[PDB]
Amino acid sequence: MDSTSTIANKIEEYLGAKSDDSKIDELLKADPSEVEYYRSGGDGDYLKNNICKITVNHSDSGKYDPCEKKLPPYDDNDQWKCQQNSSDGSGKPENICVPPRRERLCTYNLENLKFDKIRDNNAFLADVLLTARNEGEKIVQNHPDTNSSNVCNALERSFADLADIIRGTDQWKGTNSNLEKNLKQMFAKIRENDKVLQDKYPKDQKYTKLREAWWNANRQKVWEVIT
Protein backbone atom coordinates (compact mmCIF):
# COMPACT_ATOMS: atom_id res chain seq x y z
CA MET A 1 0.00 0.00 0.00
CA ASP A 2 1.03 3.64 0.48
CA SER A 3 3.80 2.65 2.93
CA THR A 4 5.97 1.25 0.13
CA SER A 5 9.67 1.99 0.65
CA THR A 6 13.04 0.56 -0.34
CA ILE A 7 14.71 -2.47 1.23
CA ALA A 8 15.66 -3.80 -2.22
CA ASN A 9 14.11 -7.28 -2.15
CA LYS A 10 11.39 -6.96 -4.81
CA ILE A 11 11.78 -3.47 -6.30
CA GLU A 12 15.54 -3.38 -6.71
CA GLU A 13 14.73 -5.34 -9.88
CA TYR A 14 12.43 -2.40 -10.72
CA LEU A 15 14.74 0.56 -10.01
CA GLY A 16 18.37 -0.56 -9.83
CA ALA A 17 18.06 -3.49 -12.23
CA LYS A 18 20.79 -2.42 -14.64
CA SER A 19 20.64 -5.67 -16.63
CA ASP A 20 19.52 -4.64 -20.13
CA ASP A 21 19.45 -0.87 -19.61
CA SER A 22 22.13 0.60 -21.88
CA LYS A 23 21.76 -0.03 -25.59
CA ILE A 24 25.48 -0.49 -25.97
CA ASP A 25 24.95 -4.13 -24.95
CA GLU A 26 25.73 -5.14 -28.54
CA LEU A 27 29.31 -4.73 -27.32
CA LEU A 28 28.67 -4.68 -23.55
CA LYS A 29 27.13 -8.13 -23.31
CA ALA A 30 29.21 -10.58 -25.28
CA ASP A 31 28.26 -13.28 -27.73
CA PRO A 32 31.40 -15.42 -28.15
CA SER A 33 31.30 -14.83 -31.90
CA GLU A 34 34.86 -14.87 -33.21
CA VAL A 35 37.15 -17.66 -34.35
CA GLU A 36 40.35 -19.19 -32.94
CA TYR A 37 40.48 -17.81 -29.41
CA TYR A 38 43.43 -16.50 -27.54
CA ARG A 39 46.09 -18.93 -28.85
CA SER A 40 44.59 -22.20 -27.65
CA GLY A 41 42.56 -23.21 -30.69
CA GLY A 42 38.98 -22.29 -29.90
CA ASP A 43 36.24 -22.23 -32.49
CA GLY A 44 33.36 -19.81 -32.19
CA ASP A 45 31.18 -21.77 -34.59
CA TYR A 46 31.56 -24.86 -32.40
CA LEU A 47 30.86 -22.71 -29.35
CA LYS A 48 27.56 -21.23 -30.56
CA ASN A 49 26.61 -24.68 -31.82
CA ASN A 50 26.99 -25.96 -28.25
CA ILE A 51 27.81 -23.49 -25.47
CA CYS A 52 27.09 -26.14 -22.84
CA LYS A 53 30.56 -27.70 -23.17
CA ILE A 54 32.93 -24.79 -23.61
CA THR A 55 36.49 -25.92 -22.96
CA VAL A 56 39.76 -24.35 -21.84
CA ASN A 57 40.94 -24.23 -25.46
CA HIS A 58 38.35 -21.47 -25.93
CA SER A 59 40.42 -19.15 -23.74
CA ASP A 60 43.97 -18.68 -22.52
CA SER A 61 45.82 -21.92 -21.82
CA GLY A 62 49.20 -23.19 -20.65
CA LYS A 63 48.85 -21.04 -17.54
CA TYR A 64 45.03 -20.82 -17.55
CA ASP A 65 43.23 -23.93 -16.30
CA PRO A 66 40.26 -24.21 -13.89
CA CYS A 67 41.54 -24.79 -10.37
CA GLU A 68 44.72 -23.05 -11.51
CA LYS A 69 45.66 -23.34 -7.88
CA LYS A 70 46.52 -26.99 -8.49
CA LEU A 71 45.21 -27.78 -5.03
CA PRO A 72 41.97 -29.67 -5.68
CA PRO A 73 39.01 -27.47 -4.73
CA TYR A 74 36.81 -29.70 -2.56
CA ASP A 75 39.18 -31.11 0.07
CA ASP A 76 38.66 -29.01 3.21
CA ASN A 77 36.27 -29.18 6.17
CA ASP A 78 35.79 -27.15 9.36
CA GLN A 79 36.25 -23.62 7.98
CA TRP A 80 34.66 -20.34 9.09
CA LYS A 81 35.42 -16.67 8.29
CA CYS A 82 33.87 -13.48 9.50
CA GLN A 83 35.34 -11.35 12.27
CA GLN A 84 38.02 -12.29 14.78
CA ASN A 85 40.64 -14.88 15.60
CA SER A 86 44.30 -15.59 14.83
CA SER A 87 43.87 -17.39 11.48
CA ASP A 88 43.52 -14.41 9.10
CA GLY A 89 43.09 -11.79 11.80
CA SER A 90 42.66 -8.79 9.51
CA GLY A 91 39.15 -8.72 8.06
CA LYS A 92 37.34 -12.07 8.24
CA PRO A 93 39.74 -14.58 9.84
CA GLU A 94 37.52 -17.31 11.30
CA ASN A 95 34.09 -16.97 12.90
CA ILE A 96 31.40 -17.62 10.24
CA CYS A 97 31.40 -20.81 8.19
CA VAL A 98 31.47 -19.35 4.75
CA PRO A 99 31.13 -22.53 2.71
CA PRO A 100 34.51 -23.79 1.52
CA ARG A 101 32.54 -23.48 -1.70
CA ARG A 102 33.36 -19.77 -1.92
CA GLU A 103 36.86 -20.64 -0.75
CA ARG A 104 36.99 -22.92 -3.81
CA LEU A 105 35.32 -21.23 -6.72
CA CYS A 106 37.07 -22.46 -9.82
CA THR A 107 38.08 -18.85 -10.47
CA TYR A 108 41.79 -19.55 -9.88
CA ASN A 109 42.11 -19.66 -13.66
CA LEU A 110 40.22 -16.38 -14.04
CA GLU A 111 42.48 -14.75 -11.43
CA ASN A 112 45.51 -15.12 -13.72
CA LEU A 113 44.81 -13.51 -17.09
CA LYS A 114 48.02 -12.27 -18.70
CA PHE A 115 47.79 -12.92 -22.43
CA ASP A 116 46.58 -10.25 -24.86
CA LYS A 117 44.34 -10.10 -28.00
CA ILE A 118 41.52 -9.60 -25.46
CA ARG A 119 40.46 -6.13 -26.58
CA ASP A 120 36.77 -6.97 -26.16
CA ASN A 121 34.51 -8.72 -23.69
CA ASN A 122 33.73 -11.07 -26.58
CA ALA A 123 36.94 -12.78 -25.47
CA PHE A 124 36.63 -11.72 -21.83
CA LEU A 125 33.37 -13.65 -21.74
CA ALA A 126 34.91 -17.02 -22.59
CA ASP A 127 37.06 -17.24 -19.46
CA VAL A 128 34.17 -16.16 -17.21
CA LEU A 129 32.09 -18.93 -18.79
CA LEU A 130 34.93 -21.40 -18.23
CA THR A 131 34.83 -20.43 -14.56
CA ALA A 132 31.06 -20.87 -14.43
CA ARG A 133 31.10 -24.12 -16.42
CA ASN A 134 33.79 -25.78 -14.32
CA GLU A 135 32.41 -24.59 -10.99
CA GLY A 136 28.95 -25.83 -11.96
CA GLU A 137 30.15 -29.24 -13.11
CA LYS A 138 32.26 -29.72 -9.99
CA ILE A 139 29.53 -28.56 -7.60
CA VAL A 140 26.95 -30.83 -9.25
CA GLN A 141 29.17 -33.89 -9.71
CA ASN A 142 30.73 -33.42 -6.26
CA HIS A 143 27.91 -32.76 -3.82
CA PRO A 144 27.49 -34.79 -0.61
CA ASP A 145 23.75 -34.07 -0.54
CA THR A 146 21.17 -36.71 -1.45
CA ASN A 147 20.14 -34.64 -4.50
CA SER A 148 17.21 -33.33 -2.45
CA SER A 149 16.15 -29.67 -2.47
CA ASN A 150 19.70 -28.34 -2.06
CA VAL A 151 21.83 -29.01 -5.15
CA CYS A 152 20.78 -26.39 -7.66
CA ASN A 153 20.24 -23.98 -4.77
CA ALA A 154 23.94 -24.24 -3.92
CA LEU A 155 24.72 -24.01 -7.64
CA GLU A 156 22.70 -20.79 -7.82
CA ARG A 157 24.52 -19.36 -4.82
CA SER A 158 27.86 -20.13 -6.48
CA PHE A 159 26.48 -18.37 -9.56
CA ALA A 160 25.71 -15.28 -7.49
CA ASP A 161 29.13 -15.35 -5.82
CA LEU A 162 30.82 -15.51 -9.23
CA ALA A 163 28.55 -12.67 -10.32
CA ASP A 164 29.67 -10.42 -7.50
CA ILE A 165 33.34 -11.35 -7.90
CA ILE A 166 33.01 -10.27 -11.53
CA ARG A 167 31.46 -7.18 -9.99
CA GLY A 168 34.33 -7.12 -7.49
CA THR A 169 32.10 -6.45 -4.47
CA ASP A 170 33.45 -9.57 -2.75
CA GLN A 171 35.19 -8.85 0.55
CA TRP A 172 36.94 -12.20 0.75
CA LYS A 173 40.25 -11.99 -1.11
CA GLY A 174 42.69 -14.83 -1.69
CA THR A 175 44.92 -14.27 -4.68
CA ASN A 176 42.05 -12.01 -5.64
CA SER A 177 44.40 -9.05 -5.24
CA ASN A 178 45.95 -10.37 -8.43
CA LEU A 179 42.43 -11.03 -9.72
CA GLU A 180 41.04 -7.65 -8.71
CA LYS A 181 43.98 -5.73 -10.19
CA ASN A 182 43.68 -8.12 -13.15
CA LEU A 183 40.23 -6.71 -13.76
CA LYS A 184 42.05 -3.41 -13.36
CA GLN A 185 44.18 -4.62 -16.27
CA MET A 186 42.13 -7.03 -18.41
CA PHE A 187 38.70 -5.60 -17.72
CA ALA A 188 40.57 -2.31 -17.90
CA LYS A 189 41.91 -2.87 -21.40
CA ILE A 190 38.43 -3.88 -22.47
CA ARG A 191 37.14 -0.78 -20.65
CA GLU A 192 40.07 1.61 -21.26
CA ASN A 193 39.81 1.13 -25.04
CA ASP A 194 36.01 1.23 -25.44
CA LYS A 195 36.07 4.99 -24.86
CA VAL A 196 33.89 6.05 -27.79
CA LEU A 197 31.07 3.59 -27.13
CA GLN A 198 30.30 4.74 -23.57
CA ASP A 199 29.84 7.93 -21.56
CA LYS A 200 30.39 7.05 -17.87
CA TYR A 201 34.17 7.49 -17.50
CA PRO A 202 34.88 8.55 -13.97
CA LYS A 203 38.30 7.83 -12.46
CA ASP A 204 40.00 5.65 -11.56
CA GLN A 205 37.76 3.81 -13.95
CA LYS A 206 34.71 3.41 -11.72
CA TYR A 207 35.71 -0.23 -12.12
CA THR A 208 32.81 -1.57 -10.06
CA LYS A 209 30.38 0.96 -11.54
CA LEU A 210 30.94 -0.32 -15.10
CA ARG A 211 31.60 -4.01 -14.51
CA GLU A 212 28.24 -3.93 -12.73
CA ALA A 213 26.51 -2.92 -15.96
CA TRP A 214 28.70 -5.31 -17.96
CA TRP A 215 27.73 -8.32 -15.88
CA ASN A 216 24.16 -7.01 -15.82
CA ALA A 217 24.06 -7.16 -19.60
CA ASN A 218 25.75 -10.59 -19.44
CA ARG A 219 23.10 -12.26 -17.24
CA GLN A 220 21.82 -14.95 -19.57
CA LYS A 221 24.98 -16.59 -20.87
CA VAL A 222 26.79 -17.04 -17.56
CA TRP A 223 23.70 -18.41 -15.81
CA GLU A 224 23.04 -20.78 -18.71
CA VAL A 225 26.60 -22.10 -18.78
CA ILE A 226 26.84 -22.55 -15.02
CA THR A 227 23.55 -24.48 -15.04
Burial 196-219 (b: 16+ CB within 10 A, else e): eeeeeeeeebebeebbbbbbbbbe
Classify 88 as helix, strand or coil: coil
- DSSP characters over 128-192: HHHHHHHHHHHHHHS--S-SSTTHHHHHHHHHHHHHHHHTT-----STHHHHHHHIIIIIHHTTS
Among 120, 117, 92, which Cα is nearest to 176's? 92
The method of structure determination was: cryo-EM
Residues 221/51, Cβ–Cβ less than 8 Å:
yes
- Tell me the C-alpha distance between 74 and 95, whole Å: 20
Contact criterion met (CB below 8 Å) for 111 and 68: yes
Q: Resolution in Å, one decimal, please.
A: 3.0
d(CA 14, CA 36): 39
Q: Does residue 110 sit in helix, strand or coil? A: helix
Q: Is 154 exposed, middle or buried (0-12, 13-18, 19+ CB in 10 A)?
A: middle
What is the Cα 78 distance to its own chain's centre? 26
Helix (H, G, I), strand (E, B) or coil at 46: helix
Residue of 178, 32, 219, 50 lying closest to 118 (CA atoms): 32
